[PDB]
Design a binder for these strands. Structure first.
Lengths: 97, 70, 134, 105
RNA sequence: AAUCCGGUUAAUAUUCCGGAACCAGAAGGUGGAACACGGCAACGUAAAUGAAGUUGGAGACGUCGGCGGGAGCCCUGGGAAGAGUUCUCUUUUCUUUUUAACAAACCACACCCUGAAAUCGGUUUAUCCGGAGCUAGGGUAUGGUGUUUGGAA
């Protein structure tokens, strides 16, 4: 929850992350996406599409409680993000969490 | 009405039995317009040289009815 | 690492949309003509029909005949699947020369069709051979 | 000058649609032009299709199959995004079907 | 489902005449076509089997406002022909100056590919788009359009 959001903010500040669906899909195909976050308000078709790729590529998937706007606010960007991937957590330890 | 640019095809439409008459038109820009009346379409051919205008005229089969400036 | 030779996938767009193919060679590193994650994959354009014992031998052979098609597809336009078919013939037979030369492409397509027919006769890769309804 | 209807039907309506021409005889007249065609639309989501003409069904009948279809499965009736939607659904719920059948077995 | 122009009668014209097209149905002959291929793709072609059965779309649709395009009418310059004006000034004043249906090619709102954005960018007259992919580049399709010709001088 709050710890996950803090770890995500630290990962976005230090590590490498792609807060985009196409970028996350490319990272999942390449296998470099260790962890991914999917917004609750995302369509079920898109959520299942990310889940299938995550299972194929052996990547952790976390369902954020908030909507796309809430996910964007947590990420600190000025636009809502429906899905994000963290290739490297940097100083953050969100990979274990 | 179709505009035909390839000389040989205009010959082969003329040789086709569906062709009935052909019209020769002399335009002010010294272009001659071979207008071949067919069943569905009027095929026209614009050739710029006066001499290709002439060697075309008798290369048309004699059975087809050529007509002077309409 | 998700894209490797011999991995069965599905096409997402184009004329052969919703068609199962096998990744013959991966060019994810890119190419001058193919500057993306293009993978040359050969699939089946006409899935084999249901063979009936009562039907004649010629009819059964015609139903079992599969027409293949080999083409390059984008990584985004390709949907990977869990199933994988390790076709020895459809491994390294596709190259730039094969894609360029039309006669070589036809020969490669004939070889792929023969390999697919042999696999169908052997009853292997049933899920890949069976068309998927949309 | 001032024109008149060519037909015997007054009362400009959805079918009494006219267009001014300048004739070769230097006369202004009406041609009763007809209702324009509309491109057929998607049944999945309602967006009009792409790549096919906007016509009435009677001159649809005069078109050719390749001017009519889009060369793909579910073509001519479903759009590109629609055919994408069917195939992704086809894939993901048989993945879901097979995983639950493994769970139950 | 499908027709335009010009002319013709004392009286009929999208009906008659001359010319140029279109639609529907029906069989065959000749030639090319061979359970087809090329484009990663938005697709495309002269062809590119489809018995039954199953399915969808067009046809098949309210009202207001702004914007842009086109067509005709109106205004207008140069030129050409005819008519009016006049010792004087007026290269003047007035009238006329046309291109139908139907065809052919060419020729931008929607989509895709490369691309991965924030330094937030693009961008409507009227602030909407975008991590559901931005800008940019390249294509795809409906191409009244005009870009020329046929009709057609």
């Amino acid at each position: 929850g709050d710890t996950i959001n803090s770890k995500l903010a630290l990962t976005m500040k230090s590590g490498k992350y792609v807060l985009g669906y196409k970028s996350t899909l490319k990272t999942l195909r390449s296998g470099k996406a260790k962890l991914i976050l999917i917004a609750a308000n995302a369509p079920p078709l898109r959520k299942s599409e990310l889940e299938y790729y995550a299972m194929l590529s052996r990547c952790s998937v976390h369902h954020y409680s908030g909507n796309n706007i809430d996910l964007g606010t947590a990420c600190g960007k000025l636009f809502r993000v429906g899905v994000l991937a963290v290739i490297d957590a940097g100083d953050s330890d969100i990979l274990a969490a | 009405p179709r505009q035909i640019s390839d000389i040989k095809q205009f010959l082969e439409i003329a040789r086709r039995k569906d062709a009935t008459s052909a019209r020769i038109k002399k335009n002010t820009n010294k272009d001659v317009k071979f207008k071949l009346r067919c069943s569905k379409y009027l095929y026209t051919l614009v050739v710029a040289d006066a001499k290709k205008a002439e060697k075309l005229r008798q290369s048309l089969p004699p059975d087809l009815t050529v007509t002077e400036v309409g | 690492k998700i894209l490797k030779p011999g991995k069965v996938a599905l096409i997402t767009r184009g004329r052969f949309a919703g068609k199962k193919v096998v990744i013959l060679q991966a060019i994810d590193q890119g190419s001058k003509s193919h500057p993306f994650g293009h993978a040359v994959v050969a699939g089946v354009e006409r899935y084999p029909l249901k063979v009936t014992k009562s039907m004649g031998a010629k009819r059964i052979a015609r139903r079992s005949r599969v027409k293949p098609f080999i083409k390059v597809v984008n990584y985004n336009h390709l949907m990977p699947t869990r199933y994988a078919l390790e076709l020895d013939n459809l491994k390294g037979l596709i190259t730039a020369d094969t894609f360029k030369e039309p006669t070589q492409r036809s020969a490669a397509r004939k070889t792929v069709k023969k390999t697919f027919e042999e696999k169908y006769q052997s009853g292997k890769s049933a899920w890949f051979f069976t068309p998927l309804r949309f | 000058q001032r024109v008149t209807y060519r037909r015997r039907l007054a009362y400009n309506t959805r079918s009494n649609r006219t267009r001014i021409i300048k004739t070769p005889g230097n006369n202004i007249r009406y041609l009763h032009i007809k209702k324009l065609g509309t491109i057929p639309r998607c049944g999945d989501t309602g967006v009009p299709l792409q790549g096919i003409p906007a016509l009435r069904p009677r001159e649809f009948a005069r078109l050719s199959h390749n001017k009519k279809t889009v060369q793909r499965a579910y073509g001519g009736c479903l759009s590109a995004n629609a055919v994408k939607d069917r195939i992704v659904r086809a894939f993901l719920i048989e993945e879901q079907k097979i995983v639950k059948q493994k769970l139950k077995q």
